[PDB]
């Protein structure tokens, strides 16, 4: 069960890769320790390969089997349909990698005969050949981070593995309707992707408050995708086949798991053979649903193994939160050790071992945590934050560069209630949109796995719908939260919060004087700045 087998061949780039922040005049006003902000490249690909390559041992027991039976019973109440070639094309992402067979994502979306003809041929092949492993390409991702001191520092580039565009569209034809419906039915309230930030918070908080003495922990699996075995991917297929599906859907799902999901060969961007995969591919339709199902399965079983009492789970990828009743500090510590023992048997050991927590604010998963502030009436309001280091580092990058993804705008939307998105991100970018003549100009923005064309002036209305009117009135943030933000600004050389407020006082006035919907932005987004 070796997760990967490699050959000499290198994981290679497809174009120029920048690894370092530039020196913009605008960038330095946000952030002045510019040697801390980097970007992964193929140069580090080999370090990542080393980490993600190991033999997997997996030993199942009745806890696993009992949970899996309960899951299949739930799956058996799901019905799902085939998408037609046309529906799958229309649901294809705008900016996904072009096909080797002469068409790209925009051709797919506009139902180009070239795309449609090819996808029909790929479908027929999936139905008629259930064995030939399907080609994939492997690439090192280009993501922006901030360096860490106390940790090792510089992370290697993540690896992505994906089949051709044509195959990706067939995946949607066979499984889009499954992957969109099945998870919620099987996992119910534990299925994290159903929640907006406020609803996730509402779930964790009501869950937390229902225990007499609450204890929670997060868990995150070391190299999760590599820990996923052929057993795991076959179990997944067996859950999908519990569904009520069309005959042709069944055939394509079985075929896709034999030819693609289970494993297959890996090829370079130059066309060379890099090796063989026997674990989860990170770039298939089924990655998110599969990781979530498999993490839930193993974690549910592992909670029974550790005898955790009145457990409640929340799962996104391999990102897991558990909230249960405390048995006491030494009891909880021992239980956690037994929880990760079971998980490790099931093949999924943790990056860092979990730690029991008695303060909900201190539980981090999906890079996020719950925290408290007060609304205009002084009432306690709970909301989702995260450490602002990465959002700021990518904000500094996107100030100095094009970027067809606007992570700053995604962060303002998702984290609109936070101290840091309000004082720093909203101020910095409205200042730049004010100086350039560009308040009316729509921007591309990737959030919750989709690409939106966002008018900056729509932000008041977006934030209100997503978070509610309170997002414009929060005050009296937690000492821990305030602390973390201030210490992150010092670490990165971004100006302290008192500077951001002055700049925002001026940003607010300039928006107000500009009159219409610009002034609406000034009122709502920056009401915090003016007494
Ligand atoms: O406006 C400030 C502010 C201005 C200047 C300095 C500080 C501040 N001092 C930084 C010490 O590290 C801490 C918190 C806030 C703050 C702080 O929480 N706020 C604030 C109050 C209400 C809403 C919002 Br958004 C921010
Ligand atoms: Mn992980
Ligand atoms: Mn994770």
From Swiss-Prot:
Q: What is the effect of changing residue 318 to E/H/N?
A: Complete loss of RdRp activity
Provide the coiled-coil residue spans.
none
Membrane disposition: Single-pass type IV membrane protein
User: Which reaction is the catalytic activity of this chain?
Assistant: RNA(n) + a ribonucleoside 5'-triphosphate = RNA(n+1) + diphosphate
The entry marks the following residues as binding Mg(2+) 2, namely: 220, 318-319
Phosphoserine modification sites are 29, 42
Question: Cofactor(s) for this protein?
Answer: Mg(2+)
Its post-translational modification remark reads: The N-terminus is phosphorylated by host PRK2/PKN2.
Per the UniProt entry, the effect of residue 225 to G/N is: Complete loss of RdRp activity
The observed outcome of changing residue 220 to C/G/N is: Complete loss of RdRp activity
Q: Mutating residue 283 to D/L/R: what's the consequence?
A: Complete loss of RdRp activity
List the subcellular locations. Host cytoplasm; Host endoplasmic reticulum membrane
Activity regulation, in the record's words, is:
Activity is up-regulated by PRK2/PKN2-mediated phosphorylation.
Record-annotated RdRp catalytic domain positions: 214-332
What does the note under cofactor report?
Binds 2 magnesium ion that constitute a dinuclear catalytic metal center.
How does this polypeptide assemble, per the annotation?
Homooligomer. Interacts with non-structural protein 5A. Interacts with host VAPB. Interacts with host PRK2/PKN2. Interacts with host HNRNPA1 and SEPT6; these interactions facilitate the viral replication. Part of the replication complex composed of NS2, NS3, NS4A, NS4B, NS5A and the RNA-directed RNA polymerase embedded in an ER-derived membranous web.
Describe the task this protein carries out: RNA-dependent RNA polymerase that performs primer-template recognition and RNA synthesis during viral replication. Initiates RNA transcription/replication at a flavin adenine dinucleotide (FAD), resulting in a 5'- FAD cap on viral RNAs. In this way, recognition of viral 5' RNA by host pattern recognition receptors can be bypassed, thereby evading activation of antiviral pathways.
Protein name, as recorded: RNA-directed RNA polymerase
Q: What is the organism of origin for this protein?
A: Hepatitis C virus genotype 1b (isolate BK)
The major lineage groups are: Viruses, Riboviria, Orthornavirae, Kitrinoviricota, Flasuviricetes
Whole sequence portion shown: 2420 to 2950 of 3010
